[PDB]
From a paper:
Calcineurin (CN; Protein Phosphatase 2B or 3) is a ubiquitously expressed Ca2+/calmodulin activated PSP2. It is composed of a catalytic CNA subunit, which includes a calmodulin-binding and an auto-inhibitory domain, constitutively bound to a regulatory CNB subunit that binds 4 Ca2+ ions. Increases in the cytoplasmic levels of Ca2+ activate CN, which then catalyzes the dephosphorylation of a plethora of substrates critical for a diverse set of biological processes including development, learning and memory. Rather, recent studies have shown that the NFATs bind directly to CN using two distinct short linear motifs (SLiMs), the “PxIxIT” and the “LxVP” motifs.
Electron density was present for NFATc1LxVP SLiM residues 384DQYLAVP390. The NFATc1LxVP SLiM, which buries ~950 Å2 of solvent accessible surface area, binds CN in an extended conformation to an expansive hydrophobic pocket located at the CNA/B interface. As expected, the NFATc1 residues that interact most extensively with CN are Leu387NFATc1 and Val389NFATc1. Leu387NFATc1 binds into a deep hydrophobic pocket formed by CN residues Trp352CNA, Phe356CNA and Val119CNB while Val389NFATc1 is anchored by a comparatively shallower hydrophobic pocket formed by Trp352CNA, Pro344CNA, Leu343CNA, Try341CNA and Leu123CNB. The canonical ‘P’ in the LxVP sequence, Pro390NFATc1, binds a third shallow hydrophobic pocket defined by residues Trp352CNA, Pro344CNA and Leu343CNA. While the backbone of Ala388NFATc1, the ‘x’ in the LxVP sequence, forms a hydrogen bond with the sidechain of Trp352CNA, its side chain makes no interactions with CN. Comparing the CN:NFATc1LxVP complex with CN:A238L shows that Tyr386NFATc1 overlaps perfectly with Phe288A238L. Second, Tyr386NFATc1 (ɸ residue) is part of a newly identified 3-residue hydrogen bond network between the ɸLxVP peptide and CNB.
Numbering used by the authors:
A (entry chain A): 11 to 370
B (entry chain B): 5 to 169
C (entry chain C): 384 to 390
């Protein structure tokens, strides 16, 4: 057997070529998302300056947007992606082409999945191409603390540089916090807040910064519904979220009051993994419509959960949920660990072990 | 009889002790250790790197380990050996053809020995590819000894590559 | 614990 050439030649080898500015952007300054999509699926990379240009130009578009977006139906609402790029490709097949489909993402594009930078680069490129029909909200992972605690900062250092990471951090600050969809739905990543009673409370926030450890901006990104949501006993509205170690748990009477006070139909959010990719919570005793909806767009979460993902396609006064399964993706060892670092302690162990026994 | 010429860290009494251990392992008194004689020890039967070690010790390339190769082999695991020669022995485990570099096919095959059925061939090939890409600085599609140490030279595994003679 | 395990 050959010692130089690759053994399993059937396995596609990631291209060393890095896309130039001329190859990605046309004469009109429009990004070629098809060229970008195909190259990224081969685990190909771009030049640093090109990647930096996609991030910054996208950031300039985002920072011209309001805290609370105004989006009308029809639109496809999406949940957590968590760096699962090859599942994101399937998402756009199921949810429809952005060339004629309006999109709303609820955040958490990075961390956990080992293709986070490809998710950002592609989504930002789509934002540049479709600035008025594709929309991105901020999730609790789009910040400096979690991306450093998990794998996204590491991913940037391995695949690109820390400069790209910094650019993303500044870009994440520009991400809108919420969206008002079809004058009926409030769309956030986490949920509600004791310091947010009206939609204008969201408009008064200063989002261009690191999310604080506590406050309204923290709660929108971090809060969860109660475990017994709809079947409360001791009630209250907001209680300390012991699962997250920060922010709050919100109850069914809490959200219902918010809906009635702001004349809204329901709340669309993500933040929590679902086996079915979605969950319909207790209907309101006024409309008979679900007061809360969780959307999760990461199938087979962490390659272990084996869950279905879903997107919410709201058109013709019909809220249809498109479930979908996971797709094949190139393998990575946990935390981008290389094989030398992985195997050497085993080498040193077994080889030493052999010699100890032949001398015993 | 003419004297034997070696190069090791061992004292006279240490070469003697290793000598009496060599004779004990030489079941047929052929003067050299064979793969079969190595595998005669139950603790080596479930070890996937025995053949790699033997091939490294076998400096003349005859398939068996004589007394000289035996001493010079074990010497790389002495307490009196530096960090470098212990990392170099590790390098040689991956470098099958002994050309001084680690290629894709080599890294795969040695990994395949150690992994077994814990990963798929396609999966293992991918992480072998990406490992070399990120560690290859001069860009010749292969891993030198310097590029190797640049990756693992802070794991302090030379500490746990020491045997008592 | 004979072969190298994925962490
Ligand atoms: Ca013999
Ligand atoms: Ca020999
Ligand atoms: Ca070689
Ligand atoms: Ca090299
Ligand atoms: Fe998440
Ligand atoms: Zn989240």
């Amino acid at each position: 057997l050959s010692t130089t050439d690759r053994v399993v030649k059937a396995v596609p080898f990631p291209p060393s070529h890095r896309l130039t500015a001329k190859e990605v952007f046309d004469n009109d300054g429009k990004p070629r998302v098809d060229i970008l999509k195909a190259h990224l699926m081969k685990e190909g990379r771009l030049e640093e300056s090109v990647a930096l240009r996609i991030i910054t130009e996208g950031a300039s578009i985002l920072r011209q947007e309001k805290n609370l977006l105004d989006i009308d139906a029809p639109v496809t609402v999406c949940g957590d992606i968590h760096g699962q790029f090859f599942d994101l490709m399937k998402l756009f097949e199921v949810g429809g082409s952005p060339a004629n489909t309006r999109y709303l993402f609820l955040g958490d594009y990075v961390d956990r999945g080992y293709f986070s930078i490809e998710c950002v680069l592609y989504l930002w490129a789509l934002k540049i191409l479709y600035p008025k029909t594709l929309f991105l909200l901020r999730g609790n992972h789009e910040c400096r603390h979690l991306t450093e605690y998990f794998t996204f900062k590491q991913e940037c250092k391995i695949k690109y540089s820390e400069r790209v990471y910094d650019a993303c951090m500044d870009a994440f600050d520009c991400l809108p916090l919420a969206a008002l969809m079809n004058q009926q739905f409030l769309c956030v990543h986490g949920g509600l807040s004791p310091e947010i009673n009206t939609l204008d409370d969201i408009r008064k926030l200063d989002r261009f910064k690191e999310p604080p450890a506590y406050g309204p901006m923290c709660d929108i990104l971090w809060s969860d519904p109660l475990e017994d949501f709809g079947n409360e006993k001791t009630q209250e509205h907001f209680t300390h979220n012991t699962v997250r170690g920060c922010s709050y748990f919100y109850s069914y009477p809490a959200v219902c009051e918010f809906l009635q006070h702001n004349n809204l139909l329901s709340i669309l959010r993500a933040h929590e993994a679902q086996d079915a990719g979605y969950r319909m919570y207790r209907k309101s005793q006024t409309t008979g419509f679900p007061s809360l909806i969780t959307i999760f767009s990461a199938p087979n979460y962490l390659d272990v959960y084996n869950n279905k993902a879903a997107v919410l396609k709201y058109e013709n006064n019909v809220m249809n949920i498109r479930q979908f399964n996971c797709s094949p993706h190139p393998y990575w060892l946990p935390n981008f660990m290389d094989v030398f670092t992985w195997s050497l302690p085993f080498v040193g162990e077994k080889v030493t072990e052999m010699l100890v026994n032949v001398l015993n | 009889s003419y004297p034997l010429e070696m190069c090791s860290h061992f004292d006279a009494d240490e070469i003697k002790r290793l000598g009496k251990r060599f004779k004990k392992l030489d079941l047929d008194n052929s003067g050299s250790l064979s793969v079969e004689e190595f595998m005669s020890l139950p603790e080596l039967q479930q070890n996937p790197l025995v053949q790699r070690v033997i091939d490294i010790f076998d400096t003349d390339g005859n398939g068996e380990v004589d007394f000289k190769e035996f001493i010079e082999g074990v010497s790389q695991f002495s307490v009196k050996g530096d960090k470098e020669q212990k990392l170099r022995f590790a390098f040689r485990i991956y470098d099958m053809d002994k050309d001084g570099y680690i290629s894709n096919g080599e890294l795969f095959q040695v990994l395949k020995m150690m992994v077994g059925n814990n990963l798929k061939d396609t999966q293992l090939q991918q992480i072998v590819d990406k490992t070399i890409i990120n560690a290859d600085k001069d860009g010749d599609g292969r891993i030198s000894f310097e590029e190797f140490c640049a990756v693992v030279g802070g794991l302090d595994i030379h500490k746990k590559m020491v045997v008592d003679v | 614990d004979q072969y190298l395990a994925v962490p």
